[PDB]
UniProtKB/Swiss-Prot annotation:
The chain holds residues 270 to 362 of 648 of the full protein. It is linked to T-cell immunodeficiency, congenital alopecia, and nail dystrophy: A disorder characterized by the association of congenital alopecia, severe T-cell immunodeficiency, and ridging and pitting of all nails. T-cell lymphopenia, infantile, with or without nail dystrophy, autosomal dominant: An autosomal dominant disorder characterized by decreased numbers of T cells, particularly cytotoxic CD8+ T cells, and increased susceptibility to recurrent infections, mainly respiratory viral infections. Additional features may include impaired thymic development, skin abnormalities, such as atopic dermatitis, and nail dystrophy. Residues 3-89 bind DNA. Expressed in thymus. This is Forkhead box protein N1. The gene is FOXN1.
DNA sequence: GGTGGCGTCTTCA
DNA sequence: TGAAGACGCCACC
């Protein structure tokens, strides 16, 4: 169908804020996106790469220390207001 | 061949 | 300057 109106940053923010602990491995970010935005179930390859590009670059998201193979990703708490504002559009 | 972290390159404002 | 994202690389298993 159409792409979501949301940037990848906001899509990731939705996935993480919706989670039980507030952090997810990227495989579960993908599952959130395909479950909530069925566009991604059939989207051309590459979108996963873009999600991970955003996670690494954006200081909005922080890589969490593995507790006891993918890392967990979490929100930068100082950037939640900004992400919340952008979501309200 | 898939996965995940991060990089390159272009477009645009 | 830099947001934004399409697309690439490569260590690792």
């Amino acid at each position: 169908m159409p792409k979501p109106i949301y940037s990848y940053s906001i899509l990731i923010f939705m996935a993480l804020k919706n989670s039980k602990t507030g952090s997810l491995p990227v495989s579960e970010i993908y599952n959130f996106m395909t479950e909530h935005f069925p566009y991604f179930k059939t989207a051309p390859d590459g979108w996963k790469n873009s999600v991970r590009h955003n996670l690494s670059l954006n200081k909005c998201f922080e890589k969490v220390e593995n507790k006891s193979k993918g890392c967990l990703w979490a929100l930068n708490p100082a950037k939640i207001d900004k992400m919340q504002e952008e979501l309200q559009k």
